[PDB]
Design a protein around this ligand. Sequence first.
Ligand SMILES: CCNc1cc2oc3c/c(=[NH+]\CC)c(C)cc-3c(-c3ccccc3C(=O)OCC)c2cc1C
Length: 158
Amino acid sequence: MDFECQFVCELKELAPVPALLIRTQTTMSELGSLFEAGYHDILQLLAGQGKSPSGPPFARYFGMSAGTFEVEFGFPVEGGVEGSGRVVTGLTPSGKAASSLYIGPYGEIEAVYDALMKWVDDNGFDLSGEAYEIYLDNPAETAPDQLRTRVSLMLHES
Ligand SMILES: CCNc1cc2oc3c/c(=[NH+]\CC)c(C)cc-3c(-c3ccccc3C(=O)OCC)c2cc1C
């Protein structure tokens, strides 16, 4: 039951758009707490300016899974939005990525990374080491067998 990139994996060119982000670090064990806290505080901050997110939330990773690791997470937003405290104005990812949609629990998401790494290797692409996840559904409110995540591995320079 290994994911297959045969038909669904693709290379995307990502258009960078504005976002509000929390740029910090965490451990596997604190990641859920962190996201629930941060994602809520951002929404709160958006509402503070009578603004709404313009897209589902996302996270960026690098050197993940090992001890304490880097994470950037947030929401894409309309222009004119401003951050406050640790919530900052930045951008969504730009450039090329090897990308696939995944449906299922986040726990079994490793398989999609496996398949994406096989597919990158086969097609002779090179990775930056960065991963990009878009959480299309709120996991709290969404059945696991219906939970949509887009998984992207960022590609390296020319
Ligand atoms: C259009 C999609 N919109 C959303 C997508 C979301 O994705 C989430 C992914 C997560 N993990 C990804 C690895 C975690 C941990 C929390 C998430 C929350 C979240 C935010 C605040 C409070 C609780 C949760 C929440 O879902 O509780 C977590 C059990 C969330 C919320 C919304 C609105």
